[PDB]
């Protein structure tokens, strides 16, 4: 079996019911972040071509996704933090334009 490295939270707080996260979170700069639910899975869609990522629970209202093979760093883990009607995507927040609001 794979060696273990503690790179996920061991004792995370549970998520809310998954319906709570679903919606279209607006942003003028990056365009909307669309969060949808299918067969137990939250997904994040970004851009005009609907580039889509599975959201994996991390801790509390924070999820992660893994970057695509088009990225400089495919498979790197990126945080998606939900708080009320906001979604913060750390990948897009370098100039503080990474909050999306539904
Ligand atoms: Br690990
Ligand atoms: Br923990
Ligand atoms: Br703990
Ligand atoms: Br919505
Ligand atoms: Br928008
Ligand atoms: Br929109
Ligand atoms: Br799915
Ligand atoms: Br796109
Ligand atoms: Br669409
Ligand atoms: Br994915
Ligand atoms: Br999960
Ligand atoms: Br979950
Ligand atoms: Br959180
Ligand atoms: Br990507
Ligand atoms: Br990583
Ligand atoms: Br990132
Ligand atoms: Ni082993």
Give me the secondary-structure topology.
Blueprint: E1 23-25, E2 33-38, E3 41-46, E4 51-59, E5 62-66, E6 77-83, E7 86-89, E8 99-101
Antiparallel strand pairs: 1-2, 2-3, 3-4, 4-5, 5-6, 6-7, 7-8
PDB class: hydrolase
Keywords: Structural Genomics, Midwest Center for Structural Genomics, hydrolase
Assembly: monomeric
Describe this structure in words.
The chain has 102 residues and is mostly beta strands. The protein has one domain: Beta Barrel (Lipocalin), CATH 2.40.128.600. The protein contains no helices and 8 strands. The chain has strands at residues 23-25, 33-38, 41-46, 51-59, 62-66, 77-83, 86-89, 99-101. An 8-stranded antiparallel sheet has the order 1-2-3-4-5-6-7-8, with no helix packed on it. Strand 6 (77-83) and strand 7 form a beta hairpin. It is globular. It starts with 22 loop residues before the first strand and ends with a strand. Bound molecules: bromide ion (16 copies) and nickel (II) ion (NI). It is classed as hydrolase. Keywords: Structural Genomics, PSI-Biology, Midwest Center for Structural Genomics, mcsg, hydrolase. The assembly is monomeric. Crystal structure of C-terminal domain of penicillin binding protein Rv0907. The protein is Beta-lactamase.
Record keyword descriptors for this entry.
102 residues, Lipocalin, 0% helix, globular, binds nickel (II) ion, hydrolase, Structural Genomics, PSI-Biology, monomeric, Beta-lactamase
């Amino acid at each position: 079996s794979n060696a273990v490295g503690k790179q996920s939270p061991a004792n995370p707080a549970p998520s809310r019911p998954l319906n709570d996260y679903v919606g279209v979170y607006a942003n003028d700069y990056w365009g909307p972040a669309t969060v949808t639910y299918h067969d137990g899975q939250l997904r994040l869609s970004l851009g005009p071509k609907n580039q889509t990522f599975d959201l994996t629970h991390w801790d509390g209202d924070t999820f992660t996704f893994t970057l695509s093979t088009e990225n400089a760093l495919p498979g790197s883990i990126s945080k998606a933090t939900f708080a009320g009607d906001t979604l913060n995507l750390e990948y897009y927040d370098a100039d503080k334009l990474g909050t999306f609001t539904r």
